[PDB]
Amino acid sequence: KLPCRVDGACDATIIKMMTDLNKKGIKVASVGQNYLISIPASALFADQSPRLNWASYSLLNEIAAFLKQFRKIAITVTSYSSKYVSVKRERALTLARSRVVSEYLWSQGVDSRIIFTQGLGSDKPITSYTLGGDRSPNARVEITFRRAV
Amino acid sequence: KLPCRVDGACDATIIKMMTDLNKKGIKVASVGQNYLISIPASALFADQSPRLNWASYSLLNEIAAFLKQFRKIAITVTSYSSKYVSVKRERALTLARSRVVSEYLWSQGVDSRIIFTQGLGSDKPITSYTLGGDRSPNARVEITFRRAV
Amino acid sequence: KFKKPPINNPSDDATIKLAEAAVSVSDSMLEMAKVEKVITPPSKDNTLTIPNAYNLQARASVDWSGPIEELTARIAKAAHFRFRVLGKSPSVPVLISISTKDESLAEILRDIDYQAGKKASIHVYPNSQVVELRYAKIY
Amino acid sequence: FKKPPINNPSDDATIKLAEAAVSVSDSMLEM
Amino acid sequence: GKSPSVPVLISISTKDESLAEILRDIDYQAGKKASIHVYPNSQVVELRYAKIY
Amino acid sequence: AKVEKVITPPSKDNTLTIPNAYNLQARASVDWSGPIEELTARIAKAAHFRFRVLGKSPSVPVLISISTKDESLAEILRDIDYQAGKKASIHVYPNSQVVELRYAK
Amino acid sequence: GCCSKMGGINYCDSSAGRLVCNNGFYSTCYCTRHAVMDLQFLMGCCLWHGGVYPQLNSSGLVVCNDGYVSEECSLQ
Amino acid sequence: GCCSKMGGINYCDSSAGRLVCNNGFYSTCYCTRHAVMDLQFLMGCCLWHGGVYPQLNSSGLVVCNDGYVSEECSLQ
Amino acid sequence: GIPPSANDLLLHVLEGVPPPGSRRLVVSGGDARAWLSNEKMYVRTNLTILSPGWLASMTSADGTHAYEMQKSPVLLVSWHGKVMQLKVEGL
Amino acid sequence: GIPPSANDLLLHVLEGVPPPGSRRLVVSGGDARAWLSNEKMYVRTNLTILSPGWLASMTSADGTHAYEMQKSPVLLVSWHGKVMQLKVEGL
Amino acid sequence: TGSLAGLQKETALSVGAQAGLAWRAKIIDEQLNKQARNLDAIYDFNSLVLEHNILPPVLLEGRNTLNLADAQSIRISDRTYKVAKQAHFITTPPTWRQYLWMDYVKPEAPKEIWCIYTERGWKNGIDQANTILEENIARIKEDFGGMILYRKLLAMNMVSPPYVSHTDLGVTGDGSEIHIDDRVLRITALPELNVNSAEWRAAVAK
Amino acid sequence: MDYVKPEAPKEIWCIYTERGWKNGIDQANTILEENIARIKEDFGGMILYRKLLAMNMVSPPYVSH
Amino acid sequence: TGSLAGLQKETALSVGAQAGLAWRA
Amino acid sequence: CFHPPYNNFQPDRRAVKRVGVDTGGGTVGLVASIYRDSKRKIIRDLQKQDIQYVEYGDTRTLIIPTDKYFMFSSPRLNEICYPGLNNVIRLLNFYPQSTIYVAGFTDNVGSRSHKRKLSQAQAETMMTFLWANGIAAKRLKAEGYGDKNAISDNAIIHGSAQNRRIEIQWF
């Protein structure tokens, strides 16, 4: 009569969606009990504007369906961009992008208690090759969490 | 319901191990209740260095399998070498050799309470023919014990 | 393929429960030892009573769970020193438990002297080559 | 060929139990 | 201060709000039992319990 | 809740500030539940200050409870002064290195 | 199959009440009853009272341990 | 076969509790019950108490000589 | 009339030793233990109990709670800011 | 009042003579003898008894020990620095 | 039973549990025997014994205590200390085998739905043995923690040490039996908590 | 409300079974309505105390420690 | 008795003793 | 051939033995050599042993468990697990210009100074083994952290087992 597992979850489904996301291009990483999802900004937003495309909601639905498989307390969403005009415009742009992404993720049914949103601008690059705009690999959105128990 | 012998031991196995070690070249001697195993240093170590060869671990496993056949309290490992540079280097080399041999023996499962290690350098030779180096018969390691009950 | 590095042998829940008890025992002992060391700072060390010399630097690996006198006699016999006993042995025996690996005989004697506590003491005279075990003036 | 120790903590609970025993023995020695 | 034996319980359900506003709502809901102070020059968030019981 | 809650301004907050004397940033671990005088004397000894008391002890002593694993001595003194309440106060003079426990009249 | 598309079940970790598979991943299956289950629906009557008082009754009434009478378990 | 690959059993030395072969080697076999055995596993219940108290019980409970009740040998 | 201080049996409940003469209860859905001695439940857990109400309480040094309360087949707990239920059998 | 000095049966236990009216017990696993006289167990051996605890003790000149203790089907002994067990039957 | 359209064994459970209990007890005893030296290192009762071979007392601690005795009145406390067991003379130190060793006796006293109920009883017996082992671990942990707590409160000067008086008689006895050196030892003051809070000593660890 | 699964069980059978099926649903709705009225009375009675305390018609409780 | 899959004279003793006792005596 | 204790710290002539034994084809041996000398085959071999490889941006990290690559509670290196260490050297041979950081991490059991000293000793041992295979000393730095920034939960058995590790980062 007692449940035998956490509901709506399966390890084969988890491995399948990690494999599909890694083949699609969204980076999924797991070290210990920490999980990281890295998304390029060109697959979600327009050219340096905080407006989502209409076709990126399918990718956001896939990310939400992956996120429903775990049990968790807090999610961190961080945005990074590249240098366009000044520091104020890019920090405001990254904050707006993180706000929109976290709003859609909270609208979908993830069972988390706290979601934190921040945008760091262009302070922490991951690649020294900085010739592109939003096509650069260091313009991204990162979703980090820890699996609980 | 009571045991009929000491476990993992047999007199036929003891005689077979003694005969095989004596044919291989490791000297096994028994006078009264005292037992002595004499090993040349060239079959274990390199040319006057405290580094074991990789192929001597099979011989060390054979010696450990012979040593598991008895009941004992204290074992003594004593090292002897030849004249190379000075007495300090010989004493340190013999102490290091006895330390490594007893460390591997204690890592294996001998059921003894105390293992004593000493290296005497070149103070006690058994043969007046001292022309060789580590190939001399008076460069050796000795493992002595007494069978208990 | 997705894997994480530590993959050991399967565990038993009895050993899991024993480890869960032992960790809390260990940090309770850590708190008690810190409090006792802060309250009472020691000022003397037994290196003065037990000094080292030549042929006390032979080494030993020992696992002993019995009385002190036989083990001390074996250490003295391996160190080629005479063995002396002072005082009356108590009717309740002084038990020690040593489980070490590859340390010097002087360090083994110092650990035995520390574990003996207020019941027995170990002294070493290297000029006469004598190891002496003395019992406490109690009872 | 080299062999591992037969009484080796190859289990993730036995490792924790053994290092807890080591810390308890060190604390007793300090006391 | 000392934590009370009866715990101080709060219930927060917001969406897209700043941390200062969240801390202010937590301080208002705690009320007379606990207080929240923020020192930005030392970067310290301090929670103090009431001098009661 | 906005109507019922009463606050105090930070200008007139009667709480001891951090004295920022260099000997008082040493970390410590304290487990204590008892009188204030003995713990304050040991905190002064660990901070290499002097310790003095002005006032008289009541019939019922002032009881505090400090249980921390890694905290500065100034923060410990601030927590002690907060837990003392209106009955006692702790003053720190760093020029002549002394701490003062003052009772309420 | 709990640890499907993996190396299979390694062991039950009772400290977390979860299975550990042959990789380094925790499984979603439970293996002890003292695991964190999000239970929201519980059966039985005289809930949020002391429970069912164990007397045998001539009538069909069900009485709780605090004197309350459960109309749902009572026979009409 | 105790003294195998030797000359056979000479006699039982009861002062040590061991057999002597026809050479001068001690045998690994025991020949008395007062021999040094490394016994670490002992059967029976109410161990580390006074033993099983010999009363006959209407129920299936097993009581030890120190007042303890052994749950393992008790019948459910 | 001075009220009684506490029940000293909650020290043994904190240490995890069951009270003498009691019988065990089965707790499902979370990490908790329960015993029944004198038509009162004694609960050892590190969660927070919200709905049913307890009579006496103690806390250990590492954060383990001990409760004395009346018998009930359901407990409402808060785990990490999330409210769930524990089911008690054997009453 | 002054406590009693000892029990004088332990001199005969040290000498190896059983007390009168007692019955024999079977001891396996080591060199020890045991007797039961008045619901008490008398053990003659030269080993060191560690776990079960004894009530009275004497020692001879050559190193033989005599113990007066309660009855128990198991004894824990130290032989030469190694801890082992002795099994007592006939109780 | 459900919708309106819907409206319109014990002996196997008994015999599985004893075999499961005995098998799990044997496996637990084997796992206890695998770690004999580590348990002796952890639960080392021998080095906590006092000067005159006296076992230290067991002390219990409680923090943040509340009692609702009745409506309109409550009683609270910050900390409480209790003496659970008292000090006494010992001849032997305790060991972990008197606490943790489980009792094993081989049971040699013995189909459509038989197997499922037999395996259900098997799981029930395994769970019962695990519960018994958990209770034994808690029972030894309580005594060892109390013995550590006594030394810590003795360091912070809240308990009194025991006091030992010894009487040294000479050569006593009659002409039929003599004793050479009689010594009578008696402890006169049991350890106890003190209530004078002005004598307590605090500890600050740098 | 309390739920226990009942597992303890034709010309004119169906219509009267349907009538009883309606009657049970009506009874459950009445029970839920009474529970809602009870919790509403308790909460409104607790609000009225705060309003009359602000309007100064009741006395606050007094605590001595 | 053992595993779950496993689940799924006196007069001679009398008469030997006196003969052994007399022979050993 | 190959000497099992570290091949006397010499560069192993691995390809010539295979292309000399695969003749009694040279092209088949060359195909096998160019397959087994690839970076992805080395990554899959390190996946067959218990060593994790993480690449993100231009920073690469190797995670090695001390419970299987060290002796118990000692800074001694376990010599039975030498193919994993040789594969680490083979993978690190592909980047001759980057700097190397090695860090040691333990669990929460023990004292703080004991944890720091054990992590520092294991980090120095791993850095010395990296230095002795040809890597210059100015490209290396070792650090031992305690239970400071763990990656799992220390209150559970498997999570506490996952925290004892050696991390090697390069650019």
Numbering used by the authors:
A (entry chain EK), B (entry chain FK): 40 to 188
C (entry chain FD): 24 to 162
D (entry chain Fd): 25 to 55
E (entry chain ED): 110 to 162
F (entry chain Ed): 56 to 160
G (entry chain EN), H (entry chain FN): 40 to 115
I (entry chain FH), J (entry chain GH): 271 to 361
K (entry chain FC): 28 to 35, 60 to 161, 173 to 268
Text of the article:
The Dot/Icm complex of L. pneumophila is one of the largest known T4SSs. The Dot/Icm T4SS has as many as 300 protein substrates, a striking contrast to the H. pylori Cag and B. pertussis Ptl T4SSs, each of which transports only one virulence factor.
(a–b) The outer membrane cap (OMC) disk has been reconstructed to 2.8 Å resolution using C13 symmetry. Together, the predicted membrane interaction sites in DotC, DotD1, DotD2, DotK, would anchor the Dot/Icm T4SS to the outer membrane at seven positions per asymmetric unit. Dis2 is positioned near the outer membrane and consists of two lobes, similar in both sequence and structure, that are pinned together with a total of five disulfide bonds, all of which show strong density within the map. Finally, we identified ‘chain 3’ as DotF (DotF1, residues 208–266).
